[PDB]
């Protein structure tokens, strides 16, 4: 006689919609950071600055050509995973 | 349409990897959505040239027939360069359907093509009479104007 298979479906493990990866480049180095979508970019900006051995105030960070304000979050700027932030010396 | 589908792909690709110092993005409409057929971009002048320091703005307009037909690229009207019409239209070979345009050309190729043209005008496309005349017969004056223009956009 036939076997009686008794199954159950495993619901798919949900995808955390919480963090994204951002690539920060200054033309000489491109550094990736993983941050929460609702966290201010300030920390990212400082970590990049000190990694490059430069003062925060000596750099300006742009997203698609628009200057970023340290208090803004990836979410506020509609950033997506692997988007790019460019660091330029401040005029 | 293949046009909007391709433009969505061009954006996904550009936002993840693009030449340093350049920027490009669709223009925002009244309701917050993007007009995929009209982009605003910026081309940085190359260091070591008279264009250095400036970031020259361009608009890229994709026709409904894109990618079969090339987009139209324009600097602001009055922009000074031998290959730039009075309207701002840039005369570039890869943007001419009868010359080197091909559907596979990417936004990156286009912007690098425009950047390369800045300091190396195409003698076979003199779209701005005074600019070409000076570039060719009055380099001293030509250089002076490019330097001033670089400050205007820096």
From Swiss-Prot, chain A:
Keyword Phosphoprotein: yes
A GO MF term: identical protein binding
Protein name (record): Ubiquitin-like protein SMT3
Function: Not known; suppressor of MIF2 mutations.
Top-level taxonomy: Eukaryota, Fungi, Dikarya, Ascomycota, Saccharomycotina
UniProt source species: Saccharomyces cerevisiae (strain ATCC 204508 / S288c)
Keywords associated with the record: Acetylation, Isopeptide bond, Phosphoprotein, Ubl conjugation pathway
Subunit-level organization: Activated by a E1 ligase composed of AOS1 and UBA2.
Keyword Phosphoprotein among record annotations: yes
From Swiss-Prot, chain B:
Entries under Pfam families matching the protein: UQ_con
Annotated pathway: Protein modification; protein sumoylation
Alphabetical list of InterPro entries matching this protein: Ub_conjugating_enzyme, UBQ-conjugat_E2_core, UBQ-conjugating_AS, UBQ-conjugating_enzyme/RWD
UniProt function note: E2 ubiquitin-like--protein ligase mediating SUMO/Smt3 attachment to septins and PCNA. Seems to be involved in degradation of S- (CLB5) and M-phase cyclins (CLB2).
Subcellular location: Nucleus
Organism in which the protein naturally occurs: Saccharomyces cerevisiae (strain ATCC 204508 / S288c)
Enzyme type, top EC level: transferase
Entry EC no(s): 2.3.2.-
Main location: nucleus
Protein name, as recorded: SUMO-conjugating enzyme UBC9
Record carries keyword Cell division: yes
Family: Belongs to the ubiquitin-conjugating enzyme family.
One GO MF term attached to the UniProt entry: SUMO transferase activity
GO CC terms of this entry: condensed nuclear chromosome; nucleus
Keywords: Acetylation, ATP-binding, Cell cycle, Cell division, Mitosis, Nucleotide-binding, Nucleus, Transferase, Ubl conjugation pathway
Other noteworthy facts: Present with 2600 molecules/cell in log phase SD medium.
Catalytic residues (positions): 91 (glycyl thioester intermediate)
Domain UBC core: 2-154
Plastid among keywords: no
Subunit and partners: Interacts with SIZ1.
UniProt xrefs under PROSITE patterns: UBC_1, UBC_2
């Amino acid at each position: 006689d036939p076997l009686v298979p008794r199954g159950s479906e495993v619901k798919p493990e949900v995808k955390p919609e919480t963090h994204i990866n951002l690539k920060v480049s200054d033309g000489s180095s491109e550094i990736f950071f993983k941050i929460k979508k609702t966290t201010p970019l300030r920390r990212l900006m400082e970590a990049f600055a000190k990694r490059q051995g430069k003062e925060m105030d000596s750099l300006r960070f742009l997203y698609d050509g628009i200057r970023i304000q340290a208090d803004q979050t990836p979410e506020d700027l509609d950033m997506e995973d692997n988007d790019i932030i460019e660091a330029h010396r401040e005029q | 349409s293949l046009c909007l589908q391709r433009l969505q792909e061009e954006r996904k690709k550009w936002r993840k990897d693009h030449p340093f110092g350049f920027y490009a993005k669709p223009v925002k409409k009244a309701d917050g959505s993007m007009d995929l057929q009209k982009w605003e971009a910026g081309i940085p002048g190359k260091e070591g040239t008279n264009w250095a320091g400036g970031v020259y703005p361009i608009t890229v307009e994709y026709p409904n027939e894109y990618p079969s037909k090339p987009p139209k690229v324009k600097f602001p009207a009055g922009f000074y360069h031998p290959n730039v019409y009075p309207s701002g239209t840039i005369c570039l070979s890869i943007l001419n359907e009868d010359q080197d345009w091909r559907p596979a050309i990417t936004l990156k190729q286009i912007v690098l093509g425009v950047q390369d043209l800045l300091d190396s005008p195409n003698p076979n496309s003199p779209a701005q009479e005074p600019a070409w005349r000076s570039f060719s017969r009055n380099k001293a004056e030509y250089d002076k104007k490019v330097l001033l223009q670089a400050k205007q956009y820096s």
